[PDB]
Design an enzyme around this catalytic site. Sequence first.
Site, PDB file in Angstrom:
ATOM      1  N   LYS A  35      45.244  32.940  89.307  1.00 47.70           N
ATOM      2  CA  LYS A  35      45.196  32.398  90.654  1.00 47.70           C
ATOM      3  C   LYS A  35      46.049  33.235  91.612  1.00 47.70           C
ATOM      4  CE  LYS A  35      47.161  28.623  89.031  1.00 47.70           C
ATOM      5  NZ  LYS A  35      47.875  29.192  87.812  1.00 47.70           N
ATOM      6  N   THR A  69      35.647  30.835  84.719  1.00 46.10           N
ATOM      7  CA  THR A  69      36.481  30.107  85.674  1.00 46.10           C
ATOM      8  C   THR A  69      37.976  30.011  85.427  1.00 46.10           C
ATOM      9  OG1 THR A  69      35.815  28.075  84.494  1.00 46.10           O
ATOM     10  CG2 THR A  69      34.553  28.688  86.519  1.00 46.10           C
ATOM     11  N   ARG A  70      38.698  29.931  86.546  1.00 41.79           N
ATOM     12  CA  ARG A  70      40.152  29.799  86.583  1.00 41.79           C
ATOM     13  C   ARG A  70      40.564  28.808  87.678  1.00 41.79           C
ATOM     14  NH1 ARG A  70      39.402  32.195  82.771  1.00 41.79           N
ATOM     15  NH2 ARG A  70      40.410  33.961  81.688  1.00 41.79           N
ATOM     16  N   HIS A 128      38.193  36.438  81.178  1.00 42.42           N
ATOM     17  CA  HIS A 128      36.820  35.959  81.070  1.00 42.42           C
ATOM     18  C   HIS A 128      36.748  34.463  80.835  1.00 42.42           C
ATOM     19  CE1 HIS A 128      38.299  36.945  77.131  1.00 42.42           C
ATOM     20  NE2 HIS A 128      37.414  36.117  76.610  1.00 42.42           N
ATOM     21  N   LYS A 144      34.381  22.125  81.013  1.00 38.03           N
ATOM     22  CA  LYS A 144      35.088  23.131  80.232  1.00 38.03           C
ATOM     23  C   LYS A 144      36.533  22.655  80.060  1.00 38.03           C
ATOM     24  CE  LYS A 144      37.005  27.763  80.926  1.00 38.03           C
ATOM     25  NZ  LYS A 144      37.180  28.875  81.914  1.00 38.03           N
ATOM     26  N   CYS A 155      40.361  33.892  74.449  1.00 37.28           N
ATOM     27  CA  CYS A 155      41.009  34.737  75.422  1.00 37.28           C
ATOM     28  C   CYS A 155      42.519  34.789  75.135  1.00 37.28           C
ATOM     29  CB  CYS A 155      40.579  34.168  76.802  1.00 37.28           C
ATOM     30  SG  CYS A 155      41.643  34.396  78.234  1.00 37.28           S
ATOM     31  N   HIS A 176      46.433  24.107  76.464  1.00 32.52           N
ATOM     32  CA  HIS A 176      47.397  25.113  76.920  1.00 32.52           C
ATOM     33  C   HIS A 176      48.658  25.326  76.087  1.00 32.52           C
ATOM     34  CE1 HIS A 176      49.463  27.647  79.731  1.00 32.52           C
ATOM     35  NE2 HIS A 176      50.432  26.768  79.901  1.00 32.52           N
TER      36      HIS A 176
END
Length: 385
Positions: A348, A48-49, A45, A265, A315, A269
């Site tokens: 992806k 976007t990715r 969720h 956004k 997430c 990472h």
Amino acid sequence: STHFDVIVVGAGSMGMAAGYQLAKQGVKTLLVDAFDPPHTNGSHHGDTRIIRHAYGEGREYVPLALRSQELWYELEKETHHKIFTKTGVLVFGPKGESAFVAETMEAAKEHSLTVDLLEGDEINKRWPGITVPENYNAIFEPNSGVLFSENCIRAYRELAEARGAKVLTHTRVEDFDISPDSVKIETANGSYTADKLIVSMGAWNSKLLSKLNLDIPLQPYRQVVGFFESDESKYSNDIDFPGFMVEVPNGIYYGFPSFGGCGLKLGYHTFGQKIDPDTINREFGVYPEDESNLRAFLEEYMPGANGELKRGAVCMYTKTLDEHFIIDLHPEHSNVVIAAGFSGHGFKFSSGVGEVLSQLALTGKTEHDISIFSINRPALKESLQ
Ligand SMILES: *Cc1cc2c(cc1C)nc1c(=O)[nH]c(=O)nc-1n2C[C@H](O)[C@H](O)[C@H](O)COP(=O)(O)OP(=O)(O)OC[C@H]1O[C@@H](n2cnc3c(N)ncnc32)[C@H](O)[C@@H]1O
Ligand SMILES: [Cl-]
């Protein structure tokens, strides 16, 4: 009293794509999910990715990335849901100090990908709103971009169901019974059998693969993202601000332009809290690092996108020790396929992975070279009970 040809446990990013691939071929399929995909409890969720082709995690992923891209363009034509926007993806970092930037560049050369190389002030000039030091360099990929992940899963689900796939929701699989010529799953709502099983439980693979006699280090991490009010004249997808994944001194960050004024956004990472998928706190902001790690990057590199926090999402990533995926047959059961450890960069590829999983379940092999994802590789540190 209903046997299926194939059962998919975990109908998220990977499972739903596999479902679509199987149903498309007339294979009688059952998908079982603990929730109702797409949802906000797993790893898909946040809207976007990023999809990149020149791949900093490793040039060996390029073929699958290109195939997945072609599959996303196909899905776009098949559904009314929005799938992909070609924002382009910018990768940058301190010159000579980013293995990620360097491999991204090597990957593009090796696969003759279309990219622009630029450095220092040229970056800031080309994209008003970005402010990097002069010793930074970059590689920009114009033809990669952004996927609307919840839309992807919803589209694959609708298309699969239209072709006969059955999706059993809010049903947690609790155990498995595998024999040489059949598989069986156990849930509170009943048990089901099939000839083949695909296991794709995301963060829960780290807790339930032991039910399949597997012992593989899989660590789930809590990963947040924030949407910030930004200068739309600079950070809007409409003025071609790109998606991005970059490396700075304290690590790697990734982000998206503002779409329809939703705000830029951003995600950090490199860092995340080690958590358990059943006890993770899914509220954004409960840890001060949630918002401060993001603003620390914004105020330094994208100063005009450091406004009020509009939205937050929590997430999960599931990391393997080498941060490469696990896509393979169960070493003791050729009728069981495993998809795990996407380590924060698998979405992806989900379209391509759905295809691979379908091929593995139906034939025990795949036309794709997936050796780098072998469940038997030593760097994984895998074993049986
Ligand atoms: C979290 C995250 C990940 C991420 C990202 C940003 C964040 C904050 N940005 C990405 C990006 O820009 N580009 C990219 O390529 N990847 C990015 N990622 C990583 C990607 O989202 C993950 O690798 C991907 O989503 C992994 O997919 P997978 O299919 O493994 O996980 P899922 O979608 O969570 O689906 C698992 C499903 O299984 C179900 N489940 C769990 N347990 C059970 C049981 N016991 N029984 C039945 N079903 C079960 C879940 O409910 C879920 O639906
Ligand atoms: Cl992941």
